């Protein structure tokens, strides 16, 4: 689990978005596994505006941050895990790393701020849903 809090936005994995996320829906993309909902409290996270391919992600299944090299956001086919079926996903970045189902929502960050959140796992790979192209997160 985990979210990004920037301005009056909460960013979550679409598949973990709560009833309260959906009630206050701003934006969702089923092809990206992202959902943004409205918050009343002004958030403190900064979104990275960069093309870094290096950063640090939080892995709850190891209670550790790992430094990783990651691919540029792409359209990538995601294979079936234990709890979720397979499918395609856009704006997806892969790294060599540990990722289990409950790891979704762990933040990937570089010196410029938040890059993405954990979205996919399995086969010694971690997938991050990129948020750096959502410029609108940095006002109103
Ligand atoms: O599956 C699901 N998650 N949230 C909702 C919801 C939220 C508000 C009103 C109706 C439904 O539905
Ligand atoms: Zn960066």
Kindly write down the DSSP assignment for every residue of the chain, as one continuous string: ---EEEEEEEEEEGGG--HHHHHTEEEEETTTTEEEEEEEEEEE--B--S---EEEEEEGGGTEEEEEE-PPSEEEEE---SSS--EEEEEEEEEES---GGGTTPEEEETTEEEEEEEE--TTEEEEEE-TT-GGGG--
The answer to whether 68 and 54 are in contact (CB under 8 A) is yes
Q: Does one domain contain both 96 and 40?
A: no
Q: Does one domain contain both 53 and 104?
A: yes
Q: How far is CA 19 from the centre of its chain?
A: 19
Q: Does one domain contain both 127 and 72?
A: yes
- Dihedral sign computed on CA atoms, order 17, 21, 22, 27: negative
Q: Does one domain contain both 61 and 105?
A: yes
Q: Does one domain contain both 11 and 70?
A: no
The answer to whether 121 and 92 are in contact (CB under 8 A) is no
Q: Does one domain contain both 89 and 107?
A: yes
| Ligand 1 near 23 CB (within 6 A) | yes
Resolution in A: 1.9
Q: Does one domain contain both 91 and 131?
A: yes
Instruction: List, as one string, the DSSP characters of 9-31.
Output: EEEEEGGG--HHHHHTEEEEETT
Q: Does one domain contain both 50 and 91?
A: yes
Q: Does one domain contain both 75 and 136?
A: yes
Exposure string of 56-66, with b = 16+ CB inside 10 Å and e = fewer, is ebbbbeeeeeb
Angle, vertex CA 73, rays to CA 125 and CA 12, nearest 5: 80
Q: Does one domain contain both 10 and 72?
A: no
Q: Does one domain contain both 61 and 25?
A: no
44 is in an annotated binding site: no
Q: Which of 134, 139, 138 is nearest to 73 (CA)?
A: 134
| Cα–Cα distance for residue pair 117/5, rounded to 1 Å | 12
Mutate to test the pocket of ligand 1, among 13, 15, 18, 19 (most ligand atoms within 8 A of CB): 19
The answer to whether 91 and 13 are in contact (CB under 8 A) is no
| Cα–Cα distance for residue pair 23/56, rounded to 1 Å | 32
- What is the greatest pairwise CA distance in the chain? 40
* Residue that terminates a domain, selected from 26, 44, 62: 44
Q: Does one domain contain both 68 and 30?
A: no
| Ligand 1 near 19 CB (within 6 A) | yes
Domain that holds residue 110: 45-140
Distances 65 to 42, 116, 139 between C-alpha atoms, Å? 26, 14, 29
52 is in an annotated binding site: yes
In the chain, the number of structural domains is 2
Going by alpha carbons, the residue nearest to atom 7 of ligand 1 is 19
| Cα–Cα distance for residue pair 105/125, rounded to 1 Å | 15
């Amino acid at each position: 689990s985990g979210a990004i809090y920037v301005g009056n936005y909460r960013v979550v994995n679409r598949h973990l978005a709560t009833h309260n996320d959906w009630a206050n829906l701003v934006w969702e993309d089923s092809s990206r596994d992202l959902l943004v909902s409205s918050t009343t409290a002004q958030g403190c996270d900064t979104i990275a505006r960069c093309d870094c391919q290096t950063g640090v992600y939080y892995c709850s299944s190891r209670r550790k941050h790992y430094p990783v090299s990651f691919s540029k956001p792409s359209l990538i086919f995601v294979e079936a895990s234990e709890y979720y079926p397979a499918r395609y996903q856009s704006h997806l970045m892969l790294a060599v790393g540990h990722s289990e189902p409950g790891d979704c929502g762990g933040i990937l960050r570089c010196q410029h701020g938040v890059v993405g959140i954990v979205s996919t796992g399995g086969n010694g790979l971690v997938g991050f849903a990129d948020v750096r192209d959502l410029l609108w997160l940095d006002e109103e």
